[PDB]
Amino acid sequence: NDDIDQSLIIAARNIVRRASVSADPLASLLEMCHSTQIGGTRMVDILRQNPTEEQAVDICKAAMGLRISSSFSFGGFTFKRTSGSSIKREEEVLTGNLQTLKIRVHEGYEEFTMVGKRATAILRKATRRLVQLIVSGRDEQSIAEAIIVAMVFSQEDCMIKAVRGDLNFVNRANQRLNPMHQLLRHFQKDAKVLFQNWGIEHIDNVMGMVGVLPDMTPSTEMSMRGIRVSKMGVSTERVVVSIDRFLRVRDQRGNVLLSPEEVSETHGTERLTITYS
Ligand SMILES: O=C(O)[C@H]1[C@H]2CC[C@H](CC2)[C@@H]1Nc1nc(-c2c[nH]c3ncc(F)cc23)ncc1F
Numbered sequence: 001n002d003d004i005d006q007s008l009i010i011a012a013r014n015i016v017r018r019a020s021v022s023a024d025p026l027a028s029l030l031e032m033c034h035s036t037q038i039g040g041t042r043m044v045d046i047l048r049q050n051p052t053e054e055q056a057v058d059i060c061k062a063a064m065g066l067r068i069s070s071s072f073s074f075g076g077f078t079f080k081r082t083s084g085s086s087i088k089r090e091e092e093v094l095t096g097n098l099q100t101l102k103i104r105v106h107e108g109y110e111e112f113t114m115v116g117k118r119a120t121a122i123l124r125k126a127t128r129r130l131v132q133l134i135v136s137g138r139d140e141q142s143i144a145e146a147i148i149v150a151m152v153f154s155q156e157d158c159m160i161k162a163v164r165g166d167l168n169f170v171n172r173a174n175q176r177l178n179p180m181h182q183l184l185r186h187f188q189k190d191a192k193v194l195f196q197n198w199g200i201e202h203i204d205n206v207m208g209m210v211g212v213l214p215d216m217t218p219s220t221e222m223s224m225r226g227i228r229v230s231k232m233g234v235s236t237e238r239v240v241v242s243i244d245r246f247l248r249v250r251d252q253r254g255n256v257l258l259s260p261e262e263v264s265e266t267h268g269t270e271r272l273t274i275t276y277s
């Protein structure tokens with residue numbers, strides 16, 4: 001049970017990475033899934049029975065019409081909506097380097113939990129606004145990673161304005177990343193202009209919680225607008241999802257739940273033998 005899961009993830013990640021470089025990735029992935037065995041059992045038979053929710057694995061499940069977790073993955077983090085709703089409106093925005101970006105802006109009030117491996121968070125947000133972020137983590141590194149993802153996800157104008165120079169990030173297949181991911185890789189290379197330009201505010205010490213400044217220094221006095229660090233940020237609903245040619249998994253409203261771009265780069269050595277085509 002434990003070894004099949006470890007091995008299935010490794011096989012799924014390899015398949016999505018190989019498929020993603022092909023002209024029609026969906027068809028490539030479907031080939032490899034149907035002609036791959038893990039410890040002697042067929043991979044499609046493992047997918048039908050195994051309950052693991054992982055980004056590469058869930059892309060493969062979707063590919064063959066299996067139900068998956070309704071969560072979505074942004075910046076490595078799993079997001080579950082705990083409350084509220086939104087609608088979608090495409091808008092042109094202008095970066096700090098005067099580059100147009102067409103963005104599907106979400107309009108509404110929504111509350112989510114973010115769960116990464118080294119940090120978790122509660123996010124509350126409105127139309128192009130971070131309302132509040134309560135974040136936990138292992139360290140300075142891991143906490144800042146979660147803050148950058150929440151800031152980009154919020155769609156705020158100060159985040160858009162803090163962009164410096166052009167955004168032409170590409171995937172392994174030489175195709176441009178879509179705008180939200182363009183923004184995310186930019187601020188993942190450097191979040192300094194982002195944090196400086198975000199804004200600061202006075203806070204009252206709720207015990208358990210602390211402020212954090214644009215240089216990541218804690219404080220009891222001030223914090224970055226909306227953001228508080230904490231010490232412990234507190235089950236699966238399977239649903240039908242869709243898949244396209246480029247392995248983008250979507251909900252019924254067309255929000256991208258998963259993609260090649262949200263599959264972890266970790267190479268790892270399988271515990272049960274994996275035989276490909
Ligand atoms: O995909 C498979 O491995 C099996 C299982 C899971 C999907 C189908 C239903 C059973 C598929 N069944 C069959 N596939 C195929 C088959 C040939 N090339 C393929 N490439 C991708 C694929 F996906 C299925 C196939 N041929 C006869 C079948 F009878």
Ligand SMILES: O=C(O)[C@H]1[C@H]2CC[C@H](CC2)[C@@H]1Nc1nc(-c2c[nH]c3ncc(F)cc23)ncc1F
Binds near residue numbers: 072073104152254
């Ligand atoms: O809009 C999309 O197609 C994708 C890409 C950009 C961010 C998410 C992950 C990739 C997004 N997916 C999803 N977003 C959302 C979503 C709700 N409110 C939001 N506000 C801003 C935002 F940015 C995304 C959202 N819900 C479910 C999703 F599944």
Ligand code: NI
Binds near residue numbers: 179182261
């Ligand atoms: Ni994207």
